[PDB]
């Protein structure tokens, strides 16, 4: 019945009683009469539970036939099976090489989708070069091998993720890119070029996958620079930071500081030049001092995902696969 | 005081036993073990493969291609695959390998490819690894040979867990390794045990033994570039598989499985009997892409 | 009093990393920051263990298996914090010093 | 082995370097840092307390 009008009806998860019992006769009450009341370590107990579950899993569907068992639990490991795949590219069949192995990896839930992956990354100790952000790199993750454009960032104590220009020489580093969904806790591997031969070590970096999300939230530091032109003890007149009086009104009360380290506050706009303002400070300034304000600007990464198709090559050139080039090669 | 010392030693023994308890999902009837052979390009990978095969079956194999499945023992079968020096092949085999045999040139020393593969294995799950070093016949059974063995062994123990075996192949009699060394090497593969890896347990995977193209011939005549339907045969490993699922084939792309059906098992294990040794009937070789006897 | 110690008569113990309570709090003390919570496998007790140096936290993740030893002496070296009685020695049977110095790689 | 961890960290002894005045403002003089400002700041504080 289950596995062998109704639409536009109420979505109510209630079991209505089609034929209620009388509940006045004694015989009806009699039907429900019985329902009413008239030294091992913590490691040993855990081990005992697992063995009971292990026996239960094996000894559940042994009675049913193999064709029946497939419907309930699927094809078990240890079976010789035949798989039919459709829409295979033609270059796979014509350029088939028996030496190169063929592997079929089953995908989990949501692994076919794409998203933003946040990873913990460390440059390998034996690699000569370092990795620059926003340059293409190939990742070996899960079952897949693909080339993407990552962002390298560092974690702060307050929780802010600020962008890094390069991978640090000796430390772990956060990496974010646009690509397929992959379960947490898995390792990954980084190469620069699969094609060609190199005398040096070819493995660029190594780490683990940490996070999956739809937003990167990565931010970059931006500084607006100004120069004093008139000074009255603490109070100084600053030009060059802004170019209109509308700009000053947006940033009134912002914390500003000099290169020397004197901290100040934006107070009010000035009319005589276009974008000057009045700022008070802890101490008197000099003409040589340079003032700036610290701002954070969110960044973005392009969504570029190019899987490797080495098997879709003629027999002699399976080793030669190329993709987007880095800044140095260009 | 001796009882207290005995009490303390027992607790230290208990400490090593401790680990995360987990449900044992290993199959009742295991599939054949995947054995990979890699090394530097001209170290002797394919010569070693023939020696192990001749150690178990007596059946002739020529033009060895792709995976080869043989019966080695009453309760164990092995699938043997050679790994090329191409970096793409090295990455895929590390994901599927259950046992790794690494070949080292003792005369030349360590090379880049040996260390690169170890880093790959540590990323994707470390399998059981046994290193075999060859070309020991160049040495003259002197101080140089004794010290070279010790130097390579201590460096090898840093990459892998200590106590991992290094096997010595002295030399070839008539272009084949000595029978006693091969027989001893085959004994180690038989008695090895394997831990469950995280990625392999969670995801089902199959190493394909045979490929067959199933398309209408007239469609190929009309357009060679047409998409083609392909049938694949292999052993199911890792986890259960559903009828309609998404699968990733590295080097090609993502596909969805249309139809799935199980087949009677070739190269099957024998029905149990107390004969001292397996006769020629029980020793079987399955290799649809290799060519058995004289036919290819 | 053979089983008096928290390790049950042993010199070392094995635990599961629950959380990095120091990291979750946003205090940059570097003495709070190197405190992690582990659960001993033998008896299930929850203790707080100390990571030797900041930056070795990067090697440790949650749900990992670590080896914890006692913290016998030099307790006053850390800055004004009680409960310094445990320290993390190994993760995945690999010493933290080997991972920090770049002499070994963690096997997954 | 806390000291062993510190010794490994201090293997590299290159320190962060100081930035100079921009070229188009070179006639103004040297760009003063915190150490330069502290000399003139303490000098003014010294005189005001005496007055």
């Amino acid at each position: 019945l289950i596995y062998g009008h109704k639409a536009d009806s109420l979505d109510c998860s209630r079991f209505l009683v089609e034929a209620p019992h009388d509940w006045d006769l004694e015989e009806v009450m009699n039907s429900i009469r019985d329902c009413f009341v008239t030294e091992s370590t913590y490691f040993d107990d855990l081990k005992g539970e697992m063995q009971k579950q292990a026996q239960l899993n094996r000894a559940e569907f042994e009675d049913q036939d193999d064709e029946a068992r497939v419907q309930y639990e699927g094809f078990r490991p240890g079976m010789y099976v035949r798989i039919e795949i459709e829409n295979v590219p033609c270059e796979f069949v014509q350029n088939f090489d028996p030496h190169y192995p063929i592997i079929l990896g089953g995908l989990g839930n949501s692994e076919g989708n794409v998203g933003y992956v946040q990873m913990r990354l460390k440059k390998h100790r034996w690699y000569k070069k370092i990795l620059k952000s926003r340059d293409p790199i190939i990742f070996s993750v899960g079952w897949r091998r693909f080339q993407t454009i990552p962002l390298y960032y560092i974690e702060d104590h307050n929780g802010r993720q600020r962008l890094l220009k390069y991978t640090p020489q000796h430390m772990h580093c956060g990496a974010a890119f646009w690509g397929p969904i992959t379960p947490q806790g898995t390792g990954f591997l980084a190469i620069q070029s699969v094609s060609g031969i190199m005398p040096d070590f070819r493995i660029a970096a190594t780490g683990v996958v940490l996070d999956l999300d739809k937003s990167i939230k990565i931010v970059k530091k931006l500084k607006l620079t100004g120069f004093p032109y008139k000074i009255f003890k603490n109070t100084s007149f600053i030009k060059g930071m802004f170019n209109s009086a509308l700009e000053v009104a947006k940033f009134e009360g912002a914390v500003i500081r000099t290169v020397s380290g004197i901290r100040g506050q934006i107070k009010k706009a000035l009319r005589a030049p276009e974008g000057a303002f009045r700022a008070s400070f802890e101490d008197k300034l000099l003409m040589s001092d340079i003032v700036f304000m610290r701002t954070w600007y969110p960044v973005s990464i392009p969504a570029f995902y190019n899987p490797v198709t080495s098997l879709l090559k003629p027999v002699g050139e399976k080793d030669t696969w190329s993709g987007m080039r880095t800044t140095g090669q260009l | 005081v001796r009882m207290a010392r005995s009490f303390h030693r027992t607790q230290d023994l208990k400490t090593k036993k401790h680990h995360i308890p987990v449900v044992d999902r290993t199959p009742l009837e295991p599939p054949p073990i995947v054995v990979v052979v890699m090394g530097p390009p001209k170290v002797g990978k394919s010569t070693l493969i023939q020696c192990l095969i001749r150690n178990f079956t007596r059946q002739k194999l020529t033009e060895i291609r792709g995976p080869v499945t043989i019966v080695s023992g009453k309760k164990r079968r092995l699938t043997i695959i050679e790994c090329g020096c191409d970096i793409n092949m090295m990455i895929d085999l590390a994901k599927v390998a259950d046992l790794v045999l690494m070949l080292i040139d003792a005369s030349f020393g360590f090379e880049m490819e040996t260390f690169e593969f170890l880093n790959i294995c540590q990323v994707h799950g470390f399998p059981k690894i046994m290193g075999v070093l060859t070309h020991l016949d160049s040495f003259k059974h002197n101080k140089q040979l004794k010290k070279t063995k010790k130097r390579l062994k201590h460096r090898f123990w840093t990459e892998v867990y200590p106590g991992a075996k290094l096997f010595y192949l002295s030399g070839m009699v008539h272009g084949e390794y000595q029978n006693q060394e091969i027989h001893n090497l085959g004994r180690f593969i038989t008695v090895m045990k394997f831990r469950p890896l995280t990625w392999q347990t969670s995801h089902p995977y199959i190493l394909a033994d045979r490929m067959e193209d199933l398309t209408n011939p007239e469609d190929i005549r009309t357009n060679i570039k047409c998409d083609r339907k392909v049938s694949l045969y292999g052993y199911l490993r890792g986890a259960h598989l559903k009828n309609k699922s998404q699968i990733h084939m590295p080097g090609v792309g993502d596909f969805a499985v249309s139809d799935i059906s199980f087949l009677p098992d070739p190269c099957a294990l024998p029905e149990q009997q107390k004969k001292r040794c397996l006769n020629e009937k029980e020793k079987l070789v399955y290799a649809p892409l290799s060519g058995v006897g004289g036919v290819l | 009093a053979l089983k008096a110690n928290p390790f049950g008569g042993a010199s070392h113990a094995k635990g599961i990393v629950l959380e990095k309570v120091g990291v979750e709090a946003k205090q940059p003390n570097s003495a709070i920051r190197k405190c992690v919570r582990v659960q001993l496998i033998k008896n299930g007790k929850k203790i707080t263990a100390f990571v030797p140096n900041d930056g070795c936290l990067n090697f440790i993740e949650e749900n990992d298996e670590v080896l914890v030893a006692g913290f016998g002496r030099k307790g006053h070296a850390v800055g004004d914090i009680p409960g310094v009685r445990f320290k993390v020695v190994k993760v995945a049977n690999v010493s933290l010093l080997a991972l920090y110095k770049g002499k070994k790689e963690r096997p997954r | 082995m806390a000291a062993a961890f510190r010794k490994a960290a201090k293997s590299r002894q290159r320190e962060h370097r100081e930035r100079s005045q921009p070229g188009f403002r070179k006639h103004l003089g040297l760009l003063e840092k915190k150490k330069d400002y502290k000399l003139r700041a303490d000098d003014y504080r010294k005189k005001q307390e005496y007055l």
Binding site: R125, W126, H170, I197, M198, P199, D200, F201 | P40, F108, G109, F110, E111, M112, E113, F115, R155, T158 | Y100, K101, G102, K103 | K7, A8, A9, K10, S11
Partner: peptide, 20 residues
């Protein structure tokens, strides 16, 4: 065409303090 290992990989000195 053989890629021999470098001196750094052969002796995994790593972050070892420099001494006179």
């Amino acid at each position: 065409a053989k890629r021999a290992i470098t001196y750094q990989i052969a002796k995994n000195r790593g972050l070892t303090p420099r001494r006179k």
